Design a binder for this molecule. Structure first.
Ligand SMILES: [Cl-]
Lengths: 473, 474
């Protein structure tokens, strides 16, 4: 009985008959007290931190373990700091923290129903409910995936399988290259997925985006015609609802109409912007999404669910059985549910439905509508700050709570603007304790604000522009 | 502005300046106390548990949320029950629970260094150490993945890219079908991977396994030769260290040698059996694994890390930059580290390294060696029990703490054996409070014991056979 031996610490596991209740309660409380201290005092740590691994033979002491946690926390990025305004990575909702505690504690497996009796059923039903908010219709549904890249991968795998019947024989027999279309501003997980799917990164054909970083439907139509002429076999168009760099939304209805005209799978990568389904004031921006063949949506971004939390939704969930699931005996439960492992890229999977369901209930649709509004308000203040300053330039109009801008100062030649913006970013972080990201975009370095932290204020944005004004004179 | 609202509960987020500190502490404490009650009393719940879903307009109350947690726990499978002896799914190490609490609190992202300054470096360094423990050499390392299926996918994607130079142009132009070889007992994530990679499920050619469910080397050589004669293009052999159903280990050194003789990528799926690296008494079972081109290993199974925790290791970690990573500017920190999203299937990714690192430190290599030995002793007790009962048959020799066996009673014709075993399994659960799984194997229904719960005892195994004896009329 290993847990009686001198070879395991008394608290290595939790005795299911309570025999080490007191000792585990103590260890758990130390971690809990420490994490809560770090989080209720998060503003004491900056948005980014200032900075010999061996697996020990013998059990580490509580002191070593607590010190490691302390060092792990102190050396981590800190989106909780009101100054953290640079990424689609938010401080987590409290119930998402607690949801993951519960999930880890019960340690169920989304691979199959018998390994996750309630969570599998909860996830299937919750995702049907969400697919309904997107307007996908009564056959719609999907699966949670560990990150949006996997959601896009699985959407693209289904589009491919549908077009080429490739589940069993593969795609190596093809005389014509399969290709997909996406905005020149669409997410890189498309190229990574295209590589993984056997299509190659070059199978993702870029469609011109406007000055406001939205896909150009006229150019979509042109690229499809060009592809056919070159003897390629288009099978999918990806529209993006909230691009990663600038946060803009493609014209989903127009793009979707073109895809449908040409018999192409219509996927909407709504990883970020999908959260607008909870805002009546803003969801008109997603008009057209209801006719998608599939949708990628990431609650871990604008719904504040602790990473990872993402899903792929299909307007006809049965497609996962016809053009994804590998040949195998089909065992459905008496209440209709199926093993989720058969119809996802992953087999074993963490129960993300716990944090998702708990966060959605604690915040509510109105809670998210208000957060979404405040996000837009903060962003509009940044837009106005940039308009007021002639040495700054916007990337273009905004569609979400994201503002990409940069310095283009006339006291420097263009070739020096990348150093100016890197330097401004460094200065804002060092002296302002304000974190902006600095993506490459349109061949240059642009500053990027993602206004997500619930505790970011007008004053933080004003502090930013004062530092920018100092840096520029 | 939102947190100063009627529209948000005072505890929806944690105020970074402490202004909701007391309310947060109490909510957290109620969930902590409830979860600890459920776990310290887990044996009160059976191994298996005995609408409509609406996203509310308004914030749920604390009472509703706590009740939902109670309902979710009570409706979940319960591997902490000493009777739960049926799957590669363990009760979690205490520090792995706590690790996920820490990871979710700081909510960093493994996608890039900038988003996980400490965790990215800790993961890269830790997996280099683990790869070294598998004996893969100085250049070896890898990445954590959300599950072993992804680890297998990534390893096969690399094998494919190396063989066919397919990162940019894909594989559609190929005139010969790419194929891989794996034991007829190997994991289905190979077929799913093969489908995903564009090879098709049928690209996975099954190799005959012995009566003890280990891959036959002679049949492997024949299948490779047959593939080449059939116009196909072999590029990878997958050996399995701990098959999912029976827990057996392919002869890794012999299979590796044959892979190498034919110039094929050698991948070892050690999802389960890779935990033997922490056991001096049993790690010889993995001999040969040190020459693998890649290894899949799942701490979430036999190292008790709460799901998910898995990795893919490469003997040359550099291969991820040459034959996987998509064309892009290479950002590299001054201390050498790279953005991990560029060299994984996933982009954004939960920080699994936290619970992995805390659990490995708390249990230690000595701890795992003890856990593993006791697993083998329980498995050996099941084997002995089966051998004593003529109406039961073992699937074959065991290589790990897994025993697959079934009834083959001579008082029934063979076509009734599936029902007998299904009835036995159902009776063990209902009457014995003992969970065995019941996979399809060799065309029939087999009982399957995975002896993982550290609180599973000889008494449990004895109770199991008592029930078995009663069901069969002694
Ligand atoms: Cl996860």
């Amino acid at each position: 009985n290993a847990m009686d031996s001198r070879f395991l610490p008394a608290t290595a596991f939790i005795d299911p008959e309570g025999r080490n209740r007191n000792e585990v309660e103590r260890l758990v409380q130390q971690v809990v007290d420490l994490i809560l201290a770090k989080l209720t005092g998060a503003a004491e740590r900056p948005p980014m931190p200032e900075t010999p691994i061996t697996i020990p033979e013998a059990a580490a002491t509580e002191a070593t373990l607590l010190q490691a946690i302390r060092d792990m926390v102190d050396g981590s990025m800190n989106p909780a700091n009101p100054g953290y305004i640079g990424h689609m990575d938010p401080m987590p909702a409290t119930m998402a923290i607690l949801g993951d505690l519960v999930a880890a504690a019960v340690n169920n497996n989304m691979l199959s129903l018998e390994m996750s009796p309630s969570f599998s059923r909860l996830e299937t039903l919750l995702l049907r409910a969400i697919a309904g908010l997107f307007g996908l219709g009564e056959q719609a549904g999907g699966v949670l995936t560990s990150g949006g890249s996997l959601a896009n991968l699985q959407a693209l795998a289904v589009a491919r399988n549908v077009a080429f019947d490739s589940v069993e024989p593969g795609i190596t027999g093809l005389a014509q290259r399969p290709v997909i279309f996406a905005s020149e501003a669409a997410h890189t997980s498309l190229q990574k997925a295209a590589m993984l799917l056997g299509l190659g990164t070059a199978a993702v054909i870029p469609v011109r985006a406007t000055a406001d970083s939205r896909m150009d439907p006229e150019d979509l139509r042109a690229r499809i015609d060009q592809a056919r002429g070159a003897g390629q076999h288009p099978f999918c168009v990806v529209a993006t609802a909230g691009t990663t760099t600038t946060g803009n939304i493609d014209p989903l209805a127009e793009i979707g109409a073109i895809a449908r005209e040409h018999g192409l799978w219509f996927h909407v990568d709504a990883a970020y912007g999908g959260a607008l389904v909870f805002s009546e004031r803003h969801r008109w921006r997603l008009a057209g999404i209801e006719q998608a063949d599939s949708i990628t949506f990431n609650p871990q971004k604008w719904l504040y669910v602790a990473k990872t939390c993402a899903m792929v939704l299909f307007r006809d969930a049965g497609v996962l059985e016809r053009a994804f699931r590998i040949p195998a005996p089909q065992m459905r439960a008496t209440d209709g549910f199926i093993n989720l492992g058969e119809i996802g890229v992953q087999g074993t999977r963490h129960a993300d439905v716990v944090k998702l369901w708990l966060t959605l209930q604690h915040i509510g649709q109105q809670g998210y509508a208000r957060l979404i509004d405040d996000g837009y308000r903060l962003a509009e203040r940044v837009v106005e700050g940039v308009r007021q300053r002639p040495f700054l330039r916007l990337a273009g109009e905004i569609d979400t709570n994201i503002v990409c801008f940069r310095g283009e100062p006339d006291w420097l030649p263009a070739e020096r603007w990348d150093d100016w913006n890197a330097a401004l970013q460094a200065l804002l972080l060092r002296e302002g304790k304000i974190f902006l990201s600095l993506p490459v975009y349109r061949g240059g370095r642009w500053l990027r604000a993602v206004l997500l932290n619930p505790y970011t204020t007008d004053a933080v944005i004003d502090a930013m522009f004062k530092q920018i004004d100092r840096f520029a004179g």
